[PDB]
Amino acid sequence: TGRTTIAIDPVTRIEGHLKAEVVVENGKVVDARLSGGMYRGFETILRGRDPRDASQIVQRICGVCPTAHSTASVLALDEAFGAKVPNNGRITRNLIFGANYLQSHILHFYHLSAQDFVQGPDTAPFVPRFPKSDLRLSKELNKAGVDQYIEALEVRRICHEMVALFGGRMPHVQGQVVGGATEIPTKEKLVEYAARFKKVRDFVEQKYVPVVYTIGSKYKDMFKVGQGFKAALCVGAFPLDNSGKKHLFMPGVYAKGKDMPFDPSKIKEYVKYSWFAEETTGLNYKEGKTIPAPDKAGAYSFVKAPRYDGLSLEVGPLARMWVNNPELSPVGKKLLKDLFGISAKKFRDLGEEAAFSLMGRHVARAEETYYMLGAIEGWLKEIKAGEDTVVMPAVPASAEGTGFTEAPRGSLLHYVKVKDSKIDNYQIVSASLWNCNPRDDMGQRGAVEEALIGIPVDDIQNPVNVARLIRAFDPXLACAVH
Amino acid sequence: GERPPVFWLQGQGCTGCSVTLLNSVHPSIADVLLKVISLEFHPTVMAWEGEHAIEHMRKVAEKFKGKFFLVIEGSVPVEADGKYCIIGEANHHEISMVDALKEFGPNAAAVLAVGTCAAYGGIPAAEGSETGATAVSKFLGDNGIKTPVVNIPGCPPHPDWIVGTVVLALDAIKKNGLEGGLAEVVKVLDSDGRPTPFFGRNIHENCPYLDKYDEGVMSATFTDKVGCRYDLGCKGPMTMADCFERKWNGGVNWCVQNAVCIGCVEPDFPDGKSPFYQA
Ligand code: SF4
Ligand code: SF4
Ligand code: FCO
Ligand SMILES: [Fe+2]
Ligand code: NI
Ligand SMILES: [S]
Ligand SMILES: [S]
């Protein structure tokens, strides 16, 4: 068969404003463009402010992952100010932020992604939908998915209670500032956090991780599509001591079948196909500039195009779990054997092709959730009730700092330059920026654009696999554009 | 009874309004969606996508003309002919937030502007912005659209403020009809469009640390929870909200206990509440 061109705007069951346009020929995607259609301009709004305001302002980039921006911002401020965060504040920050990993991954699989494979109740917002939605689960297993969707609503709410115990509230924590965390954990509130954590752990181990492998086993064809560049980025996250060298996720780049170190000087943001002034293309974040140009011919997105030494990389759970190669959960090992016939001990035992796939990214996210449980368990043993968590540094007149972390959806950095005790420049290079960006100046596609190539579309009237692929990356266009 | 149709349109928002609503305890969000409202369009959670999702909303809007509720999250950017916020595409034409509000605004029973961005402009309209970010009520008024607007601000709002205002409005309409009930709702809005049950009282005047404020006992570090937070930047004196007793996230904390209030419900947030960390 010939060509059909399909535009999807809005792509739903993601966060934010995204149009996807694919060219389908002979039943497969052969080209793709992603367009982020909403811009706010945090990088210019921030200029001239007290630098400490940043760790509140930047959270409003995104209400799903605000703790990630809070973290990147206070780390950047920590560096710029010379703030020496007390050890107990490092742990408290990890407890605040780690709890939202659990919230975000559970939200993404059940409340954003699961309807790709499960038919919800016969009322809005679960209907109407594609008449041929390719929903393969038995009546029993479908009902189980709906029941878990409903239970997961309570579980993700409990995760935000965990965030708020030491973060003040959620969305948009008050509890992280330059210098550490604003509230010393008490024994009483640590028991409250732990009791909620136990309920989340049970759900993750008994329902979430098993259901992802189980649904995946009914959709084994979805491990054979969505490979894209098979190239990934991790910048490191969640320090496990004050050395600055040991982290729950260690940094690394993976491309063309090779592991390589991460050098942040290799990051450049291109804008040829983005609605920004042509003269701003090719800037490292330390010299970044944000000059919107919504009428620029040929551009098709408010997302800049980040490249790592010219490479187009993806970010997120798959990227982190591939780069770090942790041992698989007990659940995963067993169901990989029983349901897939796969003998695996570590994450990379999935194989590059299966890991870098539509369903592989859902599996990585589930495995990572399980991985995070162990980290939070350790922090709950490490934290000292009553030990101070903050220092109160003076605002410098002149300074710069960069904060690197991993948001639930992938690598995040904030760069701040202070002059006359105010923000002179603030540049954000976020997770869904790396995934959902347009072509760079030489025409090389962004990671999701490339992963769409080869996606099957047997029925152009029900092109469900296009957005299925996109949702596997858990996109957040508010983060991508800011 | 029949749950009213609701369209949830996101302009220049961060989705924090939707997320805060997901944290509702009583009623739960499942109860809200299955028993209180019929959420016919919401890009974050709905099953369908693309032009089909847009066309579904238009079909519902036609069928329930004058009777659906429009929730607007985020501000409405008017610069560059609306191109700073495109929310969909149908019949080969892009739909800006400007277009959408002009299309559905006139035909809604009421507009609920949820969050400070939608209510007052918020961070997207703050100093350094250049998209023409505009509050919902201002945009509708500037364009001659007379549909009643209820502001439920906060960055984000508390879930109870959103759900509670919906319940209050639906109660009014049950007992007085649509026009009678909406008249009653408007009567309990303050001059900034906020329902007085949640926004009629001042944080500082009802703050548990007011005794320390009066005594001049001020915390010098965030982790000192004995003193008043004023010197650390607390904006409670200029903020109208019930967080002092409602608390957040199931009652586990609130901003003043944990750090400082930043005045997130106020029309001048953020610029009139900044710098956040000095008085
Ligand atoms: S300044 Fe803040 S902490 Fe102090 S009494 Fe007023 S509201 Fe409470
Ligand atoms: S305490 Fe202040 S900053 Fe916190 S939610 Fe209430 S009004 Fe907003
Ligand atoms: N997670 C998350 Fe948000 C995105 N993309 C950031 O950074
Ligand atoms: Fe940026
Ligand atoms: Ni985000
Ligand atoms: S996000
Ligand atoms: S986050």
Instruction: Give yes or no: residues B117 and B156 share one domain.
Output: yes
Look up residue A259 and give its two tokens.
Answer: 């592991």
d(CA A464, CA A23): 14
In chain A, where the domains are located = 3-474
Amino acid (1-letter code) at residue A36: G
- Ligand 2 pocket, residue B117 CB under 6 Å: no
Residue ranges of the annotated binding site of B for [3Fe-4S] cluster are 243, 261, 264
Look up residue A220 and give its two tokens.
Answer: 């084994």
Nearest to A482 by CA among A411, A427, A402: A427
Nearest to A419 by CA among A67, A9, A47, A4: A47
Shortest Cα–Cα distance, A144 to chain B (Å)? 16
Gyration radius of chain B over CA positions: 19
B204 is catalytic: yes
Say yes or no for a CB contact (<8 Å) between A294 and B84: yes
B85 is catalytic: no
d(CA A108, CA A475): 9
The string of DSSP codes covering A304-336 is: -EEEETTB--B-SHHHHHHHH-PBPPHHHHHHH
Strand partners, A33: A21
Resolution (angstroms) equals 1.5
Sign of CA pseudo-dihedral A58, A62, A63, A69: negative
Write down which residue in B198, B223, B256 finishes a domain: B198
Q: What is the residue whose two structure tokens read 């501000």?
A: B75
Whether the CB-CB separation of A347 and A328 falls below 8 Å is answered with yes
Q: What is the residue whose two structure tokens read 């004058």?
A: B66
Instruction: Give yes or no: residues B206 and B131 share one domain.
Output: no
Residue of A nearest to B41 (CA): A125
Closest ligand to A66 CA?
Answer: 7
Write down which residue in B198, B219, B253 finishes a domain: B198
Write down which residue in B143, B164, B198 finishes a domain: B198
Whether the CB-CB separation of B13 and B115 falls below 8 Å is answered with yes
Nearest to A16 by CA among A65, A71, A73, A70: A65
Report the residue from A12, A45, A182 with minimal CB separation from B43: A12
Instruction: Give yes or no: residues B218 and B273 share one domain.
Output: yes
- Ligand 3 pocket, residue A315 CB under 6 Å: no
| φ and ψ of A434, to 5 deg | -65, -35
- Ligand 1 pocket, residue B193 CB under 6 Å: no
Q: For chain B, what is the domain count? A: 2
- Ligand 6 pocket, residue A15 CB under 6 Å: yes
Nearest to B222 by CA among A52, A381, A417: A52
Boundaries of domain holding B19 = 1-198
Task: List Cα–Cα distances, A300 to A20, A106, A273, A293, B26, in angstroms.
Answer: 11, 32, 6, 11, 43
The string of DSSP codes covering A341-365 is: ----SBGGGG-HHHHSSHHHHHHHH
Task: List Cα–Cα distances, B63 to B56, B75, B180, in angstroms.
Answer: 11, 27, 22
User: In this structure, which topology does domain A3-474 adopt according to CATH?
Assistant: Cytochrome-c3 Hydrogenase; chain B (1.10.645)
The 3-state secondary structure of chain A reads CCEEEEEECCCCCCECCEEEEEEEECCEEEEEEEEECECCCHHHHCCCCCHHHHHHHHHHHCCCCHHHHHHHHHHHHHHHHCCCCCHHHHHHHHHHHHHHHHHHHHHHHHHHHHHHCCCCCCCCCCCCCCCCCCCCCCHHHHHHHHHHHHHHHHHHHHHHHHHHHHHCCCCCCCCEECCEECCCCCHHHHHHHHHHHHHHHHHHHHHHHHHHHHHHHHCHHHHCCCCCCCCEEECCEEECCCCCCCEEECCEEEECCEEECCCHHHEEEECCCECECHHHCCECHHHCCCCECCCCCCCCECCCEEEECCECCECCHHHHHHHHCCECCHHHHHHHHHHHCCCCCEHHHHCHHHHCCHHHHHHHHHHHHHHHHHHHHHHHHHCCCCCCCECCCCCCCCEEEEEEEEECCEEEEEEEEEECCEEEEEEEECHHHHHCCCCCCCCCCCHHHHHCCCCECCCCCCCHHHHHHHHHCCCEHHHHHC
Shortest Cα–Cα distance, A343 to chain B (Å)? 35
The 3-state DSSP class for residue A84 equals coil
- Ligand 1 pocket, residue B207 CB under 6 Å: yes
Residue B197: cis peptide before it, omega within 30 degrees of 0: no
B234 is catalytic: yes
d(CA B126, CA B267): 11
Instruction: Choose from A40, A290, A388 for mutation: most chain B CBs within 10 A.
Output: A40
Say yes or no for a CB contact (<8 Å) between B258 and A175: yes
| Chain B residues in contact with A57 (beta carbon < 8 A) | 123, 270
Instruction: Give yes or no: residues B167 and B274 share one domain.
Output: no
| Chain A residues in contact with B17 (beta carbon < 8 A) | 63
Residue ranges of the annotated binding site of B for [4Fe-4S] cluster are 14, 17, 73, 116-117, 155, 204, 207, 228, 234, 243, 255, 261, 264
Chain A with chain B: Cβ pairs closer than 8 A: 266
Gyration radius of chain A over CA positions: 22
Look up residue B207 and give its two tokens.
Answer: 């703050």
Instruction: Give yes or no: residues B96 and B130 share one domain.
Output: yes
Report the residue from B16, B42, B48 with minimal CB separation from A63: B16
| φ and ψ of B158, to 5 deg | -70, 140
Q: What is the residue whose two structure tokens read 């950095």?
A: A413
Instruction: Give yes or no: residues B25 and B155 share one domain.
Output: yes
Report the residue from B43, B56, B258 with minimal CB separation from A183: B258
Instruction: Give yes or no: residues B80 and B192 share one domain.
Output: yes
Closest ligand to A62 CA?
Answer: 5
Shortest Cα–Cα distance, B208 to chain A (Å)? 16
The 3-state DSSP class for residue A79 equals helix
Instruction: Give yes or no: residues B7 and B104 share one domain.
Output: yes
Instruction: Give yes or no: residues B237 and B180 share one domain.
Output: no
Look up residue A202 and give its two tokens.
Answer: 């049970």
